[PDB]
Each structure stands twice: as structure tokens, then as C-alpha cells.
Amino acid sequence: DDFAYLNARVRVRRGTLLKESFFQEALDLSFADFLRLLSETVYGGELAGQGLPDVDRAVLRTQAKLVGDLPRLVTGEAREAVRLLLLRNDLHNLQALLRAKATGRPFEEVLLLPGTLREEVWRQAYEAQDPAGMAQVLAVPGHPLARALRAVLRETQDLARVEALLAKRFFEDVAKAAKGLDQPALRDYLALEVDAENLRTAFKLQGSGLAPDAFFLKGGRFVDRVRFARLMEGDYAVLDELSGTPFSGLSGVRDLKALERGLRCVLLKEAKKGVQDPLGVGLVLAYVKEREWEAVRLRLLARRAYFGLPRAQVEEEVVC
Amino acid sequence: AASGGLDRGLIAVGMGLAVGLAALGTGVAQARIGAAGVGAIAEDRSNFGTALIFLLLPETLVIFGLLIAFILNGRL
Amino acid sequence: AASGGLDRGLIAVGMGLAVGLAALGTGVAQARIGAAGVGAIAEDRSNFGTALIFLLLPETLVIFGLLIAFILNGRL
Amino acid sequence: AASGGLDRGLIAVGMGLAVGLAALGTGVAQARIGAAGVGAIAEDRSNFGTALIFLLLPETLVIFGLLIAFILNGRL
Amino acid sequence: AASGGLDRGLIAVGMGLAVGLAALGTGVAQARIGAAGVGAIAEDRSNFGTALIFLLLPETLVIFGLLIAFILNGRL
Amino acid sequence: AASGGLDRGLIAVGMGLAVGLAALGTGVAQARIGAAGVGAIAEDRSNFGTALIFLLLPETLVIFGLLIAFILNGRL
Amino acid sequence: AASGGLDRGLIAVGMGLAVGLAALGTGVAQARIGAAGVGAIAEDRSNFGTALIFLLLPETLVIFGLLIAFILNGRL
Amino acid sequence: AASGGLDRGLIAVGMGLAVGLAALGTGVAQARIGAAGVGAIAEDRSNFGTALIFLLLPETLVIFGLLIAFILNGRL
Amino acid sequence: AASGGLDRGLIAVGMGLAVGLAALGTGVAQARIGAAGVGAIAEDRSNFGTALIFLLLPETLVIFGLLIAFILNGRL
Amino acid sequence: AASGGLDRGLIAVGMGLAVGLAALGTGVAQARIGAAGVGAIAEDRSNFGTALIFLLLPETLVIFGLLIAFILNGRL
Amino acid sequence: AASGGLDRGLIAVGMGLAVGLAALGTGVAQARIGAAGVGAIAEDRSNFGTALIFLLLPETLVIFGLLIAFILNGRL
Amino acid sequence: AASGGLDRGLIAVGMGLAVGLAALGTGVAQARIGAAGVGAIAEDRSNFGTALIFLLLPETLVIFGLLIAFILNGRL
Amino acid sequence: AASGGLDRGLIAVGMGLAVGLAALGTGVAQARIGAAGVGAIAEDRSNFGTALIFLLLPETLVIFGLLIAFILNGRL
Amino acid sequence: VYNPPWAKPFELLVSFLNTPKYGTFDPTPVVPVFFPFWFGMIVGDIGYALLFYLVGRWLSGYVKRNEPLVIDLFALKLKPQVIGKLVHILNWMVFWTVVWGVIYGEFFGTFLEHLGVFGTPEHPGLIPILIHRIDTAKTANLLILLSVAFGVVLVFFGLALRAYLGLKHRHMAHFWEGVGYLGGLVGVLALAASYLGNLQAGWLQGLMYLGFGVFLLAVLMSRIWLMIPEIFTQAGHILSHIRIYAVGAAGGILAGLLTDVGFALAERLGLLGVLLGLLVAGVLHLLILLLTTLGHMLQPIRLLWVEFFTKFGFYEENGRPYRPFKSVREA
């Protein structure tokens, strides 16, 4: 819709993000000190445990209520865009349900995050005895995962292939839709992310040598099949060709750890472009990403603090 | 009353248009901004005074029309 | 009005349009706040009072049309 | 019309417009709020009570156009 | 066939704008809420009745025009 | 038939607006709902009938313009 | 044959409004739905047939302008 | 041939509105749909024909105005 | 008011439109800026002066129209 | 000097409406589609010819008017 | 006025419209640019110089209307 | 010679509207496509020539009003 | 008071609409592009010159009205 | 560790009067330009202004018939008791507002009645005030031009101080800004006279005008400026003072025209029962009317804020250190 209501909600929420210095501060703490530091920020209102998993829960609970609510207000057009972001998180979870279902593992110890779909949707879905029945559970308001699933379900009920292609198909759905709206910024974020995801997919599998088409996602803007293939043959020279683009740092990066670390920074720059859009979804989109990056930092730094592992070992990870 | 002077009939009509046009401008103005305000209540009970004051400024537009309306007719 | 002639009819004409424009302006003003509004009560049940204060305000535009209309009557 | 009368034709054109414009306003108002409304049942069965209060308020706009219109014709 | 004076045409014309303009209002209203509406049916059979009742509510604007048209004839 | 007089010329005009305006209103109604609808079908051949009937309903507005045109004809 | 009477120009104007207005309604109606329509074909060639019926339904608006134009000949 | 008079002047006028109104409707019809098609083009050369067939159909509206213009004409 | 020629009806009529058009333009101008601002407050008090400052600027438009109204009024 | 007769002035007017109004409708068709196209080129170099072709299609509508206008010249 | 002259009345009218339309345009021009600005300022004090530079472009519209208005005056 | 007839004026007015209106259309056409263009450089230096070339294309419409005006002028 | 020749009023009215409509067109044109324009500047002081080139194409719209105004004026 | 209305906010602006950070001045003189006018914003008669008294009596006082203005001297509200106690300082400053607003109800009501100056009855016998007499071109005009005048002075107040920022710091850039805009004033005044008497000047100063444009541009060109266009908007500031003041009149008048249907006469042919026939709608409408004029008083602050928050020899410049001054002078 009108992004008026939404924007305002995000602005208050933007009020509880910390400053750089928090993250800077967290580094010389102890776990005790962490417990106190954490207890004074907004997450602190659900901090009251004493162990590390309790921190994880605090994050979960805080994010559950502060983000997990937002599309749900009304599912207006703008809300639909937002719905896509959070939906990506359901997709992973959904996939987790597919593996869980397939070896039938007592579901109850599979713990899925809150996304947009309700907890009872997961439980019922589990009680839906087939991926077709499951898709019908999803089908109820009309859901892009339903549709991705319907398209995939025709070719095989081979679980693993289904998970891969379902995700692949899901981003194909997202791509058409995102291209379909008035959100140059979303079109860009999705697009760079797709490219980045391909690039990483290609990077990670070096030393398999398979046919590229099984792994090449759709939505590119800097990744074409030929480069993709080339990296999949192991040719790193692919990485020197996207210099000057938003991917300029890809020169000389031949390890995965560093690669993702850089890539994550690039997408961070993209989230920052769309800043404070009453124009549309640019602002909410940015907020969501920011909260994740915060979350990453809370949990990791909590752990770092918890076990007292060297400061220097971790410092790069919050450093873009 | 009755039928006489075209001038009186003609002027009364055009008087409305000034008032009406401004009203239209106010309505559009209030709708976006006014809506933005509802979120404000949610955000801060404290900021609320700002939200109300922001809505107010467009209504002045209407007032110019009334002023103009009076001068045009209202002297009979 | 009643039985009359040509001068009165023109002033009668402009009366409706004046009224219509403000009415329309009110509707657009109501639509945006109103749509947001059903959600606002939901989010903030305490805020329901705010919703009451809010809802009244756009309607004011039409009232201006009446003010100009009342004064116009006196020859209509 | 029917018999002569200079006034009557002039008022008749504009008679439709006063009402028509208010009706058009009623529609814009309803379109956004109503849209908010369909979701509202889904979130809360409860929100129907809000929904009853909400819908009426735009409807007032039509009633006014007809009221002034009654004064134009309904006297003759 | 039949014809009239300068006066007669104005009532003949003006009947249409009232109904048409209001009709335009009903459509904008119905379209948005209706558009929103369809998912509710899909999910739940139970929500359908309200949505159905909802669509009538803007349409009332048209009915007034038809009435204004009926009374107008007999002067036409 | 043939040429006529000035009064008749007026009688044709507002008649076009009665049909045209209703059609225009119907078009907005069709556009928003029409866009929403297709997914229900896509999933279910079975759901089509409700959708079909829904889309059908605003269209009645148009017939009213023709009704006004029919009653009028043989007076132009 | 050439020219015509004083009357004819007035009827000529209003024939266009009837047709034009419905057409305008058609364009908006078709545009929104048409946009919704294209993705289904790409995914499923089979679903083009439903989509095909969908577009068709607004087209009746265009026809109404031709019908009113046809009957009018008899005055032109 | 040669000149006529007052009648011709009116007819040219309503002719323009007829074509123009249709043109505007066409513009909207083509604009949304036309944009939607291109993505289909991006994916498939195979779907391109569908997009092509789609675009033409709204353009008919202008043609319809012109048909009506010819009937007006023959004195033009 | 009073009366004093054909001239007066013309000078009065078009005068309003100058004001009205500017007023309408101001309202839209104000609506976009007005909405954006509230978010600035929410995040921060410091920009609030700016939020106010943004609002000040469109209002100049209204007055220029008012100058035109003023000179025109100033012969009556 | 170089004044013309009654016939000519009116007809020239109604010719323009066709040219301007269509210019606006075509522009609307081009804007959405045109915008879509630049994104297509970036993605797909092969598609550029199609994109180029796409823009051509609305511009024709105005041109139909120009042809009728051309014919008017040589009497006009 | 104090003496007639219908002719003077037309120029008096048109002096305003030039002014009104440009004003109307300035407002829309300001609204999109302005809105972007509040965020821009917030983010960057540095972006402010641009924000100011931006404001300059809308001012041009008003100047023209007035220019034409001025040239017209010195005759009235 | 500064003076002349009403007749010259009749043809002149409707000619002007053509020029104003098309220009207005060109701007909207330009605005969406124009919006795409700044982004086009950022992403692609390669798209810049094309995007830039695209902008020119609705503009021919504007030229048509001027051309028709020039040829018409110098008889007036 | 005072009265001028037949020429001035008709040409004057339509002169204004030509500039005003184009001016309005410029505003919408500026508004989309201009809004787009700021993000590039904020990031890129360097990309700015092209952004300047983007604004430039819309600037023609005011000029067209003026060009036509020069030939017309002096008949005033 | 470990008069009164005039003095109270004046004492808090004093702390920033003593602060050294420029050789320019602070917004302490602000209090007498604002204060009367703020009160004179209240305009009205029998059905309105002359009833504002009651409102005041509940503030510095209360009446216990008021559901949330229970015992306000000991503060009880729909917000905290403490806030109520603290804003005793305010409750009085508002009360003073009420005392003067009632007074400007008679100030307004001078031109609303008598047989001293208007040839119709001494006080209308139904209710005094029945038709507000100001619709005469002249009667209105003098009240319009009156409002303008307090604004022209405010233009002076800023630009002098502004020029002083650049004078006393040797910011040639601030000096040039202040000076050029005072050049600007000369051209405005030429054109205005040619419409204000029509023929008062306009050739006294309308041929001086050719030389007035020269008075303008001398120091703008010395700064060169890249935002040379901005001088339009600077003309918009001269006019703004007029315009707000104009609104202050018009919105005022609008307020007044509601008593002519809301307390005077609007129902029935005319009777001596019309007094109690009219109150049925009148009373509801009254509070809505009341609210809006609260909005109107923010027009002043904004007016001031045009100068204040935008550096005309002042700290705040779209924010900055130094805090919303409105909120400071209130006490």
C-alpha cells in the first residue's frame, strides 16, 4: 500500500539499532560483561537467562516480534514486497521440513524460526502426509512457495532435487515479481544477490566439474552461463572480469571465507542505497538486512565472549 | 430573487470554484500526511503533537478561498 | 428552489458544485487515514481513543461548503 | 419544463452534480478503507466491530448532497 | 418527435450526470475492496458473506440517482 | 430524423454521459477486481464460477444508462 | 449532402461522449487485467485460454458505444 | 468542394473528443500490458508472438472513434 | 457585489481559478513532503526543524494566485 | 487582417483535439512500456530490436488524426 | 469594474489561468523532489547543497505565468 | 495590425490546446522513461546512448502541434 | 472599464493554456526524473553531469508555449 | 549535587545571552515581538473570544465538573500529576493568554458594532453581534495592511542580525547575504505602491525602480553565488511576512463568520426563541473551531522560525545545537 504506516513503524525500530561502538565495545567483554551489556539494549528485555543458548533465544524472540509481525498488518502491495523478504526465510525452513519429513525424524526437535508462516502452519504441514498435501496447506492465501512447489512437483518426488530446484524455482518466482514492480531498489537487491549466490555457488563447487545448468540460478546481471561454467571448470580468471562493477574486490580472493565476507559487504552497500524511502520498500528492506547483520554480530560476539576465544580471530568478521 | 442581472448569477458560481479547488488540495494533502500520523501514535505517544500540527498546515488553503468568496459576493 | 426565474437558478447551480468538491475532498482524506486506521486499533488497542479523535477531522471540509452555502441562501 | 419556468432547467443540471460528486467521494473513501477491512476479519473476528464503526463515517458524504438537493427540488 | 424550449434541454441533460458520476463513485469503491476481497474466499468459506454484503454498500449511491431520475420525469 | 432544433440537440448529449459514465465506472470496477481474480482460476478450474459471477455484478450500472436512453428515445 | 442544421452539431458532440467514455473505461479495465494475464501463459500455455476469456469480458463496453451510435442514425 | 457553416463547427469538435478519448484509453491499455509483455520476451522468443497479438487489441479503440467520425462526416 | 456590467462577471470568474489552481498545486506539493517528514521526526528530533522547513515552501504558490485575485477584485 | 468565415474557425478547433488528446494517450502508452524496455536491453542485447519496435506501436494513433487533418487541408 | 467591456473580461480571466497552471505544476514538481530531500538531509548535511539546488528548478514555472500576466497588464 | 476579429480567435484557441496538451503528455511520457535513465548509466555506461535516444521519441508529437500551427498561421 | 477589439480575448485565453499545460507537463516530467536524480548525486558527485543532461530534455516544454506566444503577441 | 509573564522566559534566554560563541545576538528580544501578537491572534465576539475567559479559569484553576481537570492546582490529568505541577508555570502563561484573548475579543468587537462609525444599530437586541461589518473594501484593507506591518519589521529584525554575523566575524559571505536581501526590499516596495494607492507612487518610485534593481545586485554579485536564483525565494520571505499576517486576518475572519449562523441567526424566520433554537448545533461546532485557532498560533512560531532556524544572526539552522526555542519561551 501506502508505505506511511509501515515507514513509521520502521523509524521507531530504527531507534533501537546500536551505534558502531557497541560492536566495538563488545570485543573486550567477558561473558558476564556480555550478559550485562546485552541486558541494557532492547533485546535485554528478554534477556534473563544465563547461558549462551538463552542469548540465541533472546534474539529469536526479539526478532520474532519486531520483524515477524510486519507484513502481517495487511498484505497490501508494499507489504507483498516485504512478504517476499521474510518468505525467503520460510523457504529455507520449508526445506528443513522436507529433509525432516523424508527421514521422518520426530519433527518436534526440528526447530524452525518464525518467518511469516505460523508455527501451526509448520505443524499441520508436517501432518500433511505428502508434498502435494503440504503445497495445499501453503496454497490457502496463494503463496509463491506453493507455486514454486507446484511447478517442481511435476518432475520427480526425489527429495533432494526437489529441495534444490524448489529454491531455485522460488527465486525464479521472486525475480519475475520483483522485476514486475516499481522498486528499482528491490530489483537491484535481488539481482545482485542472485549474481552473488551464483558466484558463490560456482566458487564453492570448484573441483566437481559438473554441467553448469544444474546450478545456474536465474536473475543475473553480471553472471552469464559462460563465466559461470568457466569458474565451475575451476578457472578463477572469471573473478577478475567483474572489476570496477560493484564486485571490484573479487580480485585475488580464492578462499570461500573471504569471498562470502566481501560479498556480504557488497550487498550491505546495496541495502544502504535505498535509505529512507517513503518512496517505497527501500527503507523496510534496508531495515531488515540491518537487523540480520546486527543479529550476526550479537550471537557471534556473544559466543566469542562466552568461550574467550582471541579478539583478533573474529575482528575481520564485523569489519567491512 | 426573480430574473435579473446575469452578473450576479455568473459571479456566484465562480466564487465556489476558488473555495472548491482549495478544498480538493487540502483533501489530498491531508490524506497522505494524515495517514502518516496514525503510525505516529504507534511510534510515540510523545511525538503525537507534531503529527497533529503537521496535518493542520494544508487547511489554510481553504481559508484563502473563503476570503476570496466574501469579496466576490456577500455584499448582497 | 420553489418556483423562480433565471437569476436564482445560476446561484443555485454553483451551490451544488461547492458542496460536491469539499465532499469529495473529505472522502479522499478519509480513505487514507481510514484504511490505516482499522489496522491502528489492532496494533494499539489503547490507541483506539486516538482513532476516535482522528476520524472526525477530514469531515470538516464538507462543513465549509455548508458555511458558504448558508450565506448564499438569503437570495436562494 | 412541463410548463414554462426559466429557473428549473438551470437548477436541474447542477442538481445531479452536487449528489454525483459526493457519491464519487464516498467511493474513494470506501475503496481504501474497505480494502483494509477484508483482511480485518481474517486477523480478528473482533475487528468487525471496528468495521461497523468505520464504514458509516464516509457514508455521511452522500447524505449531505441529497440534503442540500432536497432544498433545491422538493420545494416545487 | 418532440422538442422544447431552451429550458427543457437542461433538465434532460442533467439527469445523467447525477447517476453517472455517482456510478463512477460506486465503481472505484467496489473495485478496490473487491480486489482485496478475493483471497479471503479462497482461504475460508466463512469470510465470504461479509464481503458480499460489503459490495452493496457503495452501490447505494446509484439508487439515489435513479430516484432523482423518476421524480424528474413528469416534468419530462 | 433529418436535422432538428436546438432543444433536441441537448437531449442527445446528457444521454451519452449516462451510458458512457456508467461504462467508465464499470471499467474501474473490472480493472482492480479483474487483476486479482485470475490466480483463483489458475489453481482451480472449479473456483472460476464465483469469480465470473463477481466480475459480472458491477456491469448492471451500464444497463441503467441504456434504460434512461430507451425511455427518452422518440423525444430526440 | 453537406452541412446540416443548428441542431445537428449538438447531437454530434454527445454521440462521442457516450462512446469515448465507455472506451476510456475499457482501456483502464483491460490494462490492469492484461498485465496480470501474461505470466500465466509463459508458465502454462494451457492457462492462456482462461486468460483469453478474461480480457474479453471488458470488451462489451466498446460495443455499447456502437449500439447507441447505430440507433442514433434516425436523427443523422 | 466548399464551405457550409455552424453545424460543421460543432461536428469537428465532438469528433476530436471521440478519437482523443479513445486514444487516451488506448494509451493506458497498452502501457500496462505492454510493459508486462517485455519480461515474457526476455525469457522467450517463443512467447513474443503472444505479446505482439496482445498489443494490437487496445489500438482498436481509436479506430472505433474514427468509424463513428466517418458516419458524422459525409457532410465533412 | 452590487452590479456593473458583463465585464464584472468575467473578471470575477477567472480570478478564482488562478487562486484555486495554485492552491490545489500547493496541496499536492505539501502532501508528499508532509508524509516523508513524519518519519524524520521518529528517528530524530534534530531534523524536525527541517521537517517544518520543508512544509513552509509550497505555500508561496497560493499567494501568487492571490495577487492575481487581488488586482482583479480591486476594481469592484 | 486576413480574417476568415464562421465555418472555418470552429472546424480548426475540433481538429486540434484529436491531435493533442491522442498525443497525450500515446505518451502514456510509451512511458510505461519504454521504461520497461531499457531494462530489457541491459539484460538482453538480442531483444533490442523488439524494444525499438515496441515504442513505435502507440505513436501511430495520433498519426490517424494527422491523416484526417491533412485531408481537411485543401478545403481548410 | 465601473464600465463594461466583455473583451477586457477575457484577458482578465486568462491572466490568472497562466498563473494558476504554472503554480499547480510547481507544486507537483516540488513534491517529488522535496520528499526525497527529507531523507537526504537526515543522511547528509552534505546532500543539502544539492537539495537547495533542486528547489531552484521548480521556481521557473511561476515566473512564466506572471510574465505573460505582466505583459497583458498595462492595458487593463 | 494590433486588433482583429473573433473569428481568428476561434481557430487560435483550439490550436493552442493541442500544443499545450501534447507537451503535457510528452512530460509524463518522459517522466517514467526518464526515471529509468539515471540508473541506466550507473549500471551500464553501455545503456546510456540508448536511454538517451529513447527520450526523444514521444517528443515528435509536440512538433506536430507546432507544424500545424505554423502552416495555419500566415493565413491568419 | 475600458474595451478593446474583437481579437484580444480569444487569443489571450488560449495562449495561457498552451504555456500552462506544458508547464504542468514539465513539472510531472521533472518530478519523476528529479526524484531519481538525487540518489546518483548523493553517491556520485561524478555522475552528476549526466543527471544535468537528464533534466535538460524536459526544459523544452516551457519554451514551446513562449515561441507560439511571440507570433500571436503583437496581434494584441 | 552529591512583569512576571515577561520576566519568566526572559530569564532562561539570558543564559544564552551570556554564552560567547559569536559577536552576533541571540533570540531574547523575541519575547515582546511574539507576546502581544500571540494574544491578538485571538479574535472574536460574544459567541467566541469573550468566552475564552472560562477556559483560562480552569487552567490556573480548574472546575471539578471536568472529568480530567479534577484538582489541577494539585494536578490530576490523563497524563501525570507531576507534569501538571511543573506546568503551573505554563498554566499561568496560558491564563494570561486567556486574559488578553478575551480582551482582543473586544478589540475585534470595536469594528463589529456601534452607531459611532457604522450607520446601523448600537447593539443587536437579540444577542449583540449579528453581522460582522468589515466586508467593506476599505474596512478590510486597513486590517490587512495593519497585519503586514508587524511582519515588515520582523524582516528587518532578522537581516540586521544576519548582517551582523558576517560583520563581526568578518564572514563576507554572511555580510553579503544580509545586505543583498535588503536591496531586494526596495524593488518590492516599488511595485506594491503602484497597486496600493494605485497611483500613490509607481512613478515616484517606479522610475527610481530602474535604479532600485541596481541597489539589489551590488553585493550578491560580490559573493558571485552559484545559487543566484535563491533571491526569488528571498522575495518570498518579504512576502511571507505579509502572507502569514494576511492569513492571521483571514483565518481570524473565518472564525468570526461562524457566529453569524452559530449564535446570531440561521434558523427560523426570526423570533425571540432563536436564542435557544440555535444552541443545538452551535455548541458542538464550537470546540472544533476552538482547536483550530490553536493551530493558528503556531503560525507565529513558524513565522519567527522562518528567520530563527535559518540563520539571520541565530544559532539554529535547520536544527543544530540550541534547542526548539518555542518550547523555551513558553514559560
Author numbering:
A (entry chain M): 3 to 322
B (entry chain Y), C (entry chain X), D (entry chain W), E (entry chain V), F (entry chain U), G (entry chain T), ...: 5 to 80
N (entry chain N): 302 to 303, 323 to 651
Show me the paper's own sentences about this structure:
The V/A ATPase from the thermophilic eubacterium Thermus thermophilus (Tth) is one of the best characterized rotary ATPases. The a-subunit is connected to the A3B3 stator in the V1 domain by two peripheral EG stalks which form a peripheral stator apparatus (A3B3E2G2a1). In addition, the dodecamer c ring composed of two transmembrane α-helices, the d-subunit and the DF shaft constitute the central rotor complex (D1F1d1c12), which rotates relative to the surrounding stator apparatus. The proton motive force generated by respiratory complexes drives proton translocation through a proton pathway made up of both the a-subunit and the c12 ring.
After refinements, 57.9 % of the particles corresponded to state1 and gave maps at a resolution of 5.0 Å, higher than those of state2 at 6.7 Å resolution and state3 at 7.5 Å, containing 15.2% and 6.3% of the particles, respectively. Local resolution analysis by Resmap22 for state1 showed a range of resolution from ~ 4 Å in the V1 region to ~ 5 Å in the Vo domain, indicating conformational heterogeneity within the complex. Local resolution of the hydrophobic region, especially of the c12 ring, was limited to ~ 6 Å due to conformational heterogeneity even within the most populated state1 structure. In order to improve resolution of the Vo domain, we employed the focused classification by using signal subtraction of hydrophilic region for state1, as described in Supplementary Figure 3. The improved map of state1 at 5.0 Å resolution allowed us to build a model of the whole complex. The inclined α-helices a-TM7 and a-TM8 are intimately associated with the c12 ring composed of 12 c-subunits, each with two transmembrane α-helices joined by a short loop on the cytoplasmic side. The tilted a-TM7 contains the conserved R563, corresponding to R735 in the yeast enzyme, which together with E63 in the c-subunit forms an essential feature of proton translocation. The density for a-TM7, where the R563 is located, is in close proximity to the center of an outer helix of the c-subunit. The cytoplasmic cavity provides direct access to the hydrophilic residues on a-TM7, reaching the Arg-Glu pair between a-TM7 and the outer helix of c-subunit, suggesting that this cavity corresponds to the cytoplasmic half channel. The periplasmic cavity in the center of micelle shell faces the helix bundle composed of a-TM1, a-TM2, and a-TM3, including a line of hydrophilic residues, and connects to the aqueous hole giving an access to the inclined helices.
